[PDB]
Ligand binder design. Structure first.
Ligand SMILES: C[n+]1cn([C@@H]2O[C@H](COP(=O)(O)OP(=O)(O)OP(=O)(O)OC[C@H]3O[C@@H](n4cnc5c(=O)[nH]c(N)nc54)[C@H](O)[C@@H]3O)[C@@H](O)[C@H]2O)c2nc(N)[nH]c(=O)c21
Length: 263
C-alpha cells in the first residue's frame, strides 16, 4: 500500500473522541464567530461567506495562484472563493457555477468589495456543461469518503473536469481530494507534464483530510510532495500541545469596484 492508505485506515480506526482531537491538532484555524453572527444577522458587507475565503487567501498571498482577468469558480457553493476573487486588483470578471439546491450550499448574495464583478449561478452541474474560456480556473470540489477508492475516483473526475477547462496559460488552484491513491498520482503526473504547477498543502486543512492543491505557480515532484504530507499527518497522530492556531478572518471590503472601500 501507500503511506496514505495506511494513514487513512489508521484514521478510520480512531475512537470518536480521539478523532475529534486529531482533526484539529496543530493546524491553522480562521477565527469566524463574528463573521458568522453577522451573516446570520443579514449583513452583507465585510464578511466572508465561509471559511473558504481565508483558505483561498493563503494561496494568493503566497503567489501560488494569481487570479487575473476572467475567473471561473467551478463548484462554488456559498461563494467564498468567488467574492474573494472579486476584490482583487487584476480580476476583471468572476463566474462561479454551482449545483446547490437542497442538501447543497446555495450561493449567498453579498455586497463585499467587487461584488459587481461576481456572477454566481446555482442549479448547474459543472461536470456536464461545456468549458467556457478563462484566465483563472478554480475548483474546490471533493466530498471526502472513508473509502479511499471512492475518494480516488471523485478526485479523478475533478481532475478530468479541470483538464477540459485548461488552456496554455491559465492560472489555477484545484483541490486534489485524495492525492495518495496511485491512479490519482498517475493522473497528476500526466497533468503536471501538460500544465505545470505542483501540489501544495494548506495549513488550514484539517488533519482528517489528505487534500492537497494543484496550484499553477509552484513546482516539486508529485510523489515526494504527497509522501511528505502523508508522513506529516502520520506524525500528528502522536502529538502533544494540541490547540489549533487562529487567524483573523478576511475583511472583504464593501461596494462597487473603485469607489468603493477595498479589502
Ligand atoms: C466523522 N469522521 C470522519 N472520519 C474520517 O475522516 C474523513 C473526513 O471526514 P470529516 O467529517 O472530517 O470530513 P467531512 O467532509 O466533514 O465529512 P462528512 O461527510 O461531513 O461526515 C464524516 C464522514 O465520515 C464518516 N464517519 C462518520 N463517523 C465515522 C466513524 O465513526 N468512523 C468512520 N470510519 N467514519 C465515520 C461519515 O460516514 C462521513 O462520510 C472521513 O472520510 C473519514 O475517513 C472519521 N474517522 C473516525 N475514526 N471517526 C469519525 O468520527 C470520523
Amino acid at each position: 500500500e501507500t503511506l496514505g492508505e495506511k494513514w487513512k485506515s489508521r484514521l478510520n480506526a480512531l475512537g470518536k473522541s480521539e478523532f475529534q482531537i486529531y482533526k484539529k491538532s496543530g493546524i491553522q484555524e480562521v477565527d469566524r464567530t463574528l463573521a458568522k453572527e453577522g451573516i446570520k444577522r443579514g449583513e452583507t458587507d465585510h464578511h466572508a461567506v465561509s471559511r473558504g475565503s481565508a483558505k483561498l487567501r493563503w494561496f494568493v498571498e503566497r503567489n501560488l495562484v494569481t487570479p487575473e482577468g476572467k475567473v471561473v469558480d467551478l463548484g462554488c457553493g456559498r461563494g467564498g472563493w468567488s467574492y474573494y476573487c472579486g476584490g482583487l486588483k487584476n480580476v476583471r470578471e468572476v463566474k462561479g457555477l454551482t449545483k446547490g439546491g437542497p442538501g447543497h450550499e446555495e450561493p449567498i448574495p453579498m455586497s463585499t468589495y467587487g461584488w459587481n464583478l461576481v456572477r454566481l449561478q446555482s442549479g448547474v452541474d459543472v461536470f456536464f456543461i461545456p468549458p467556457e474560456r478563462c484566465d483563472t480556473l478554480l475548483c474546490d470540489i471533493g466530498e471526502s469518503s472513508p473509502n479511499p477508492t471512492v475518494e480516488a475516483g471523485r478526485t479523478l473526475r475533478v481532475l478530468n473536469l479541470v483538464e477540459n477547462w485548461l488552456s496554455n496559460n491559465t492560472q489555477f488552484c484545484v483541490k486534489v481530494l485524495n492525492p495518495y491513491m496511485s491512479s490519482v498520482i498517475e493522473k497528476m503526473e500526466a497533468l503536471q507534464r501538460k500544465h505545470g504547477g505542483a501540489l501544495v498543502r494548506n495549513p488550514l486543512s484539517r488533519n482528517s483530510t489528505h487534500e492537497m492543491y494543484w496550484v499553477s505557480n509552484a513546482s516539486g515532484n508529485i510523489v515526494s510532495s504527497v509522501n511528505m504530507i502523508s508522513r506529516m499527518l502520520i506524525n500528528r497522530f502522536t502529538m502533544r500541545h494540541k490547540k489549533a492556531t487562529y487567524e483573523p478572518d478576511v475583511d472583504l471590503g464593501s461596494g462597487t469596484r473603485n469607489i468603493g472601500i477595498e479589502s
